Design a protein around this ligand. Structure first.
Ligand SMILES: NC(=O)c1ccc[n+]([C@@H]2O[C@H](COP(=O)([O-])OP(=O)(O)OC[C@H]3O[C@@H](n4cnc5c(N)ncnc54)[C@H](O)[C@@H]3O)[C@@H](O)[C@H]2O)c1
Lengths: 149, 187, 90, 55, 97, 142, 168, 442
RNA sequence: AAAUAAAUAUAGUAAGAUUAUUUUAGUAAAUAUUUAUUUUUCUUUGUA
RNA sequence: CUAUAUUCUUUG
């Protein structure tokens, strides 16, 4: 690409991205919920900037937060999202606010279940947190099996 | 959002560095077309929202003062079709008014770097066939672009010159004096 | 509204002569004096063509003043200021 | 570099004019509104998806 | 008698408020301010739950006790956002577990 | 139907406009589960896997067993036969091209890109193939 | 169903966006008038009905025929502007038209004198027709030469049987 | 019958009485004899200049590319085209200049025509598309109705059992075979096609028809179409004084009524419009060659109680310009208002067609100067469009203090901050710590 | 079950009809419609 | 075809 280009599209291939970046250009991989498409293609209809949804989960994994595709949420991931709550323990890490104070499982039944889980799977580091034995096999939770990083 | 030349909202969140771009001279010729036909459109909306009756037949003449639009509809036509058309036109206007600010700068940089003659000669879009689309009488000896290719002055020799004469006895009729060709009829 | 932007619009009166070449020497459209509304013509002085004119079509009996869109000028209101109108009791 | 003849990786150039002057080409060929040159490859009888083509 | 037959009961786009304006008049500034002035103090927006899908979405304009109407409340809120009128009432709260 | 008829002079029935079939009616999903079409324009195979499989695997041989794991073009008669059901949307439109198995993006957008749909902000730029909008946190269908 | 209600008045004129499938090739002198009757009564019937329905419906709901309730009734008493965007009224939209027309008429006085100022001046330069009068390429039209006669001091329309080439 | 079939050549004697009529008949004198009607070409209408008079400077010849002025003549005022002229694909590539007629039939100032409009060189397939559209469109589709087998009103029962009789096997005899019957698949309006025609084709074909009317020398350009009174005899006084042939038998006049040079209108001149209903061959049409896109809201089957045709539900109305009524009426009388409106509506259209290395030079040449941006003084528009325009000039002041102002939308972008909420995905706008952005309602 | 009133059930081993001559390429596999390849010798060949 | 087989392999 002889001249620099500044472009916002969705999910460009790696070679197109490097071909743009070699020129001194720019690429930002925007990824939009349907409402986003209608609001960009028909800007005149909406006078005020209106609260726009974050795209869904699988698309956030693969596109918006991907440095390789150069998605637009990468800063947000590297600043806000990748850090847990400051109080949060390891088990309660994923929760927005820790449901209890103490990290230890707070129910005798839940504790019995965690013991059984840690002897079920052999004792691996992550075994503390319960993961259910059964699956969805649904496409909205699946991520990349293997590919170039 | 996007739709101006600056960038969308999700590049501000993204923090991509778009600011020190290279400025080039782009005439913005397509947008002027789109603007012409946007501004053409806005006015039409103002006309068709503002129709009122003038009925030229007596049975239909009881309505002659009223708007052709029901007020409840005229309002909605003002919101939906009309005042958003103004916004479209508005966007085109912005995208040109950015770029005159940029083209001024390109012209100044090239005026300093080159000089007015060289600069203005480089910033000219002239194609060697631009006379074909603008003043074709300067292009005639270059190519034959006519739909009448038999009447172009290079091929003009082909069309026949009749010898014709007017007649008073026929009522002002002009008539070709050329003899007809005898035709092959039989085998 | 004082002169409008369009009052400067370019028309070619004669080739090489423009209406903007007069410049105030510009026609301000709202400052043009409005002619009074013409009503239907008074009946002729003669019974014959009065009866024949009364016999005419509804289309032929259409009075023409402007000729375009309201055919007859609307009369100006009694007040030149919007608060100069007396407010009655609600 | 000049504006008309700019570097393009795709390659696109405005028409160069006739390769010889003092000569008149009997025909004149118009580019499309997007800059494309007129030849279109169709198929004769596309419904049955025949490989037989034309221009 | 059926005032609306099965087809026009079936169309929920007309009935529910998706993507549709439910208040069709737009008030000037000193109109909006007077309309806000007739709200009794000690009133939160968060006390007016959004009605379910079964309930028709409509707004009677500014009537007495218009702040009890959900869609009227928030439509007025939008005009107050456009006109640059300060919004005296609260804002909608999202309760979380 | 004649100006004498006692048949037609007493009204009986009046026939209406008849509704048309689903435009995609003939792309049946029993094809769409089995095959998939692969090809460059004007030449496209429909390809499928083999069944000999789920009855007797053991004892035969490994080569004849894994000759089953390859995609293969269907026999051309069957391809013409299945394609023929896709060709019946326009007869005597010779300039057209048959419908594909799976609807392409042009074929999804073609139904919202008309000048009869341009005011419909539903179903524009594809809708029903996107995941649904997050509902108002108090949303309920009752 | 969906018959495209929004395109009903969209058309520039009164006769478009109307499904007119009852028609002919040749329309006579009064069939044409019938056509122009049908179209404007199609607009007027549909507008006046839509006025009547809503005025009556607003009256049955106990409010003003406009749909303008008690509140907006109070605002007009106190002198408050009752709506956000005061669109142009009937009298206004008539006034625009007549001011435009009253500009155009004046201009058509001035243009008249302009052109009459020119035309007399380039007539005195040209008593004889210029190099368009030559029929070397093709015959002149006697239908048109009767129209151009007045300007020149000579008799144009008297045309020799033989074609004339830069004829005097 | 057919040329080949033996039925042809019949009536070997008796076709002509062998004896001359003693009034009209005559012998062929020789090669020096001029026969009435005789011409070497297949003319189905053998009209000469006397029967169908053409008004133009020169009788159209093969030496002349068009029968009009190729250069502005020094003895008349010359008005240039309203919009600047660009030469597109099918254009004549030569200067077309036409005289303007007064209403007193003398020639007044000369005016240059637009070769994009009056120069698009006619080729017959396009005009064919136009003509077939017009003749298929202009049928009465409500009259195509017919009875059908289920519509007959007979008993539905087998009228005699088919076992032992020598009678045909017949039951429920309301079929198409029978004199009182009706067909299986009859004709009826909701099955009849009304053709859809896109703007490109209509525009092109009408342009080529106008050009055809120029090339035949049958085009006339007039100052105004205006009558003293709305009455009919004023109209006939006009048509008689300037030599329009409006008799049924004679070739008619096709009016495009535009207003004038200075005051163009989209509406007809009222005075002229009421006088224009004469029984003769004449037609007054709208001053536009374009058309609205044709929408079909039953494209599938959907609405069943539609009577209608099947097809475009928005057919071109009858008072437009077309190939049919152009071919019927010989003189095409175009008012200058119509000229201006045509050029105005076709300008952007012709600009888009040009190749992109050419469209880039348009701003440089001053073609694209825009009144909205304000680089020039605004241009001449019609009455109605000036009205609308001044309407918006008047109403532009109510949007100033409102944030939804169309004339300055989104002025707050470049001081704006954006904040991504993680509790629920939303990106909310903030200015001065205040939330500006509006969460949508459902 | 009978009569009266409504429907368009199905009928290549039940069937019967199906509207315009003077014509211009042949006989899976065949035949038919549209269309394609100048592949080498002394002559010859409708292959796709 | 439906069930049992759930990694590159397996039943009726
Ligand atoms: N899918 C959508 O929700 C959608 C689609 C297209 C446009 N919009 C636009 O989104 C914005 C708000 O949508 P919402 O659904 O959250 O509220 P809403 O549009 O349902 O209700 C908004 C309230 O404010 C009024 N209003 C709308 N525009 C106004 C204006 N320009 N000036 C004064 N009052 C106005 C509405 O008529 C109503 O009274 C509006 O511009 C709306 O037209 C929304």
């Amino acid at each position: 690409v002889p001249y620099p280009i500044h472009i916002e599209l969705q999910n460009a291939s790696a070679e197109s991205i490097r071909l743009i970046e070699e020129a001194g250009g720019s690429f930002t991989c925007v990824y939009m919920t349907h409402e986003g498409l209608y609001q960009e293609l028909h800007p005149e209809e909406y006078p005020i900037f209106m609260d726009q949804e974050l795209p869904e989960r699988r698309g956030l994994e693969s596109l918006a937060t991907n440095p390789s595709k150069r998605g637009w949420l990468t800063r947000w991931y590297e600043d806000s999202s990748k850090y847990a709550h400051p109080a949060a323990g390891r088990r309660y890490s994923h929760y927005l606010k820790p449901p209890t104070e103490r990290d230890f499982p707070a129910t005798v039944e839940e504790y019995e279940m965690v013991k059984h889980h840690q002897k079920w799977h052999l004792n691996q580091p992550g075994t503390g947190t319960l993961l259910p034995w059964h699956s969805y096999n649904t496409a909205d939770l699946v991520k990349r099996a293997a590919g170039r990083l | 959002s996007g739709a101006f030349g600056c960038g969308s909202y999700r590049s501000v969140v993204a923090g991509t560095q778009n600011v020190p771009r290279r400025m080039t001279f782009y005439p913005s010729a397509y947008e002027l077309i789109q603007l012409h036909k946007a501004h053409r459109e806005v006015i039409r909306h103002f006309y068709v929202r503002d129709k009122i009756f003038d009925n030229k037949f007596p049975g239909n003449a009881l309505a002659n003062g009223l708007f052709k639009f029901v007020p409840n509809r005229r309002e909605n036509y003002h919101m939906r079709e009309l005042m958003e058309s103004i916004r479209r036109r508005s966007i085109w206007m912005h995208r040109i008014k950015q770029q005159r600010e940029i083209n001024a700068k390109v012209v100044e940089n090239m005026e300093v770097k080159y000089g007015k003659k060289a600069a203005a000669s480089m910033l000219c879009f002239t194609t060697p066939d631009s006379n074909a689309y603008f003043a074709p009488h300067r292009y005639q000896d270059v190519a034959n672009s006519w739909p009448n290719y038999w009447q172009h002055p290079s091929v003009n020799h082909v069309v026949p010159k009749p010898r014709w004469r007017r007649h008073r006895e026929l009522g002002g009729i002009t008539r070709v004096e050329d003899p007809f060709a005898v035709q092959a009829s039989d085998y | 509204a004082a002169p409008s932007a369009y009052d400067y619009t370019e028309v070619e009166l004669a080739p090489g002569i423009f209406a903007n070449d007069a410049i105030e020497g510009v026609i301000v459209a709202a400052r043009v004096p409005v002619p009074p509304p013409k009503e239907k013509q008074p009946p002729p002085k003669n019974p014959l063509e009065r009866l024949k004119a009364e016999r005419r079509s509804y289309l032929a009996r259409t009075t023409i003043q402007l000729g375009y869109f309201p055919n007859v000028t609307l009369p100006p209101p009694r007040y030149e200021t919007v608060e100069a109108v007396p407010r009655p009791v609600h | 570099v000049g504006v008309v003849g700019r570097d393009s990786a795709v390659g696109y150039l405005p028409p160069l004019g006739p390769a010889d002057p003092l000569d008149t080409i009997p025909f004149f060929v118009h580019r499309s509104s997007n800059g494309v040159l007129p030849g279109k490859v169709f198929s004769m009888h596309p419904r049955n998806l025949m490989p037989a083509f034309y221009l | 008698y059926r005032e609306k037959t099965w087809y026009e009961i079936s169309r929920t786009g007309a009935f529910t408020k998706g993507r549709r304006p439910v208040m069709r008049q737009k008030y000037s500034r000193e109109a909006l301010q007077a309309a806000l002035a007739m709200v009794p103090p000690g009133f939160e927006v968060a006390d007016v739950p959004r009605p379910p899908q079964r309930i028709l979405a409509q707004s009677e304009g500014i009537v007495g006790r218009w702040y009890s109407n959900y869609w009227t409340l928030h439509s007025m809120r939008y005009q107050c956002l456009l006109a640059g009128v300060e919004w005296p009432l609260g804002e909608r709260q999202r309760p979380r577990t | 139907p004649k100006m004498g008829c006692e048949e037609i002079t007493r009204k009986a029935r009046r026939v209406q406009l008849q509704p048309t079939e689903y435009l995609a009616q003939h792309r049946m999903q029993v094809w769409q589960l089995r095959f998939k079409e692969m090809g460059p324009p004007f030449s496209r195979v429909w390809v499928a896997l083999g069944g000999k499989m789920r009855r007797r695997r053991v004892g035969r041989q490994v080569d004849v067993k894994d000759m089953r794991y390859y995609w293969r073009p269907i026999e051309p008669q069957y391809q013409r036969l299945y394609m023929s059901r896709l060709r019946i949307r326009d007869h005597s439109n010779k300039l057209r091209q048959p419908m594909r198995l799976r609807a392409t993006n042009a074929d999804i957008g073609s139904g919202s890109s008309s000048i009869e749909w341009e005011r419909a902000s539903n179903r524009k730029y594809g809708a029903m193939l996107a995941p649904p909008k997050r509902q108002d946190f108090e949303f309920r269908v009752v | 169903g969906f018959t495209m209600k929004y395109k009903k008045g969209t058309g520039l004129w009164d006769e478009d966006h109307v499904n007119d499938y009852k028609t002919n090739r040749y329309l006579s002198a009064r069939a044409t008038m019938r056509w122009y009757q049908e179209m404007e009564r199609h607009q007027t019937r549909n507008s006046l009905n839509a006025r009547r329905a809503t005025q009556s419906h607003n009256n049955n709901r106990g409010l003003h025929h406009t749909g303008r309730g008690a509140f907006e009734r109070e605002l007009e008493r106190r002198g408050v502007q009752v709506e956000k965007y005061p669109l142009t009224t009937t009298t206004g939209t008539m006034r625009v038209a007549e001011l435009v027309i009253l500009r155009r008429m004046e201009l058509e006085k001035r243009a008249e004198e302009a052109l009459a100022e020119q035309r007399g001046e380039l007539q005195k330069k040209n008593p004889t027709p210029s190099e368009w009068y030559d029929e070397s390429k093709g015959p002149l039209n006697p239908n048109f030469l009767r129209s151009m006669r007045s300007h020149y001091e000579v008799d144009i329309a008297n045309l020799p049987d033989t074609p004339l080439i830069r004829g005097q | 019958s057919s040329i080949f079939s033996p039925r042809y050549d019949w009536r070997t004697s008796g076709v002509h009485d062998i004896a001359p009529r003693d009034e009209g008949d005559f012998l062929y004198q020789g090669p020096q004899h001029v026969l009435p009607g005789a011409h070497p070409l297949p003319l189905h209408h053998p009209h000469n200049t006397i029967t169908r008079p053409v008004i133009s400077p020169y009788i159209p010849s093969p030496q002349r590319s068009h029968p009009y002025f190729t250069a502005p003549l020094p003895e008349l005022p010359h008005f240039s085209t309203t919009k600047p002229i660009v030469y597109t694909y099918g254009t004549m590539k030569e200067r077309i200049i036409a005289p303007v007629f007064n209403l007193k039939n003398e020639v007044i100032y000369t005016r240059e025509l637009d070769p994009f409009i009056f120069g698009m060189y006619p080729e017959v397939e396009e005009l064919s598309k136009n003509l077939t559209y017009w003749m298929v469109r202009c049928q009465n589709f409500a009259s195509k109705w017919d009875y059908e087998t289920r519509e007959i009103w007979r008993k539905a029962k087998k009228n005699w059992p088919n076992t032992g009789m020598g009678m045909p096997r017949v039951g429920n005899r309301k079929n198409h075979l029978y004199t009182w019957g009706g067909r299986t698949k009859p004709s009826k309006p909701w099955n009849m096609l009304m053709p859809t025609m896109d703007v490109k084709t209509w525009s092109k074909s009408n342009r080529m028809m106008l050009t055809l009317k120029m090339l035949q020398g049958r085009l006339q350009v007039v100052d105004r179409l205006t009558l003293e009174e709305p009455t009919q005899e004023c109209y006939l006084e006009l048509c008689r004084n300037m030599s329009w042939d409006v008799r049924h038998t004679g070739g008619g006049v096709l009016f495009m009524d535009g207003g004038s040079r200075i005051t163009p209108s989209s509406e007809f001149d009222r005075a002229f419009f009421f006088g224009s209903f004469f029984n003769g061959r004449n037609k007054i049409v709208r001053p536009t060659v374009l058309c609205d896109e044709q929408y079909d809201y039953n494209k599938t089957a959907a609405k069943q109680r539609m009577k209608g045709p099947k097809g475009a539900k928005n057919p071109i109305p009858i008072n437009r310009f077309n190939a049919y009524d152009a071919m019927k009426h010989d003189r095409l009388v175009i008012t200058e208002g119509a000229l201006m409106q045509l050029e105005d509506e076709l300008y952007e259209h012709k600009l888009q067609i040009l190749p992109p290395h050419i469209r880039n030079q348009l701003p440089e040449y001053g073609y694209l100067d825009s009144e909205a941006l304000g680089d020039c003084v605004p241009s001449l528009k019609t009455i109605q469009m000036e009205a609308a325009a001044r309407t918006e000039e008047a109403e532009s002041d109510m949007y100033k203090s409102f944030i939804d102002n169309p004339y300055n939308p989104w002025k707050d972008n470049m001081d704006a901050s954006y904040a991504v909420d993680g509790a629920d995905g939303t990106v909310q706008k903030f200015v001065d710590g205040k939330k500006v952005s509006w969460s949508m309602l459902s």
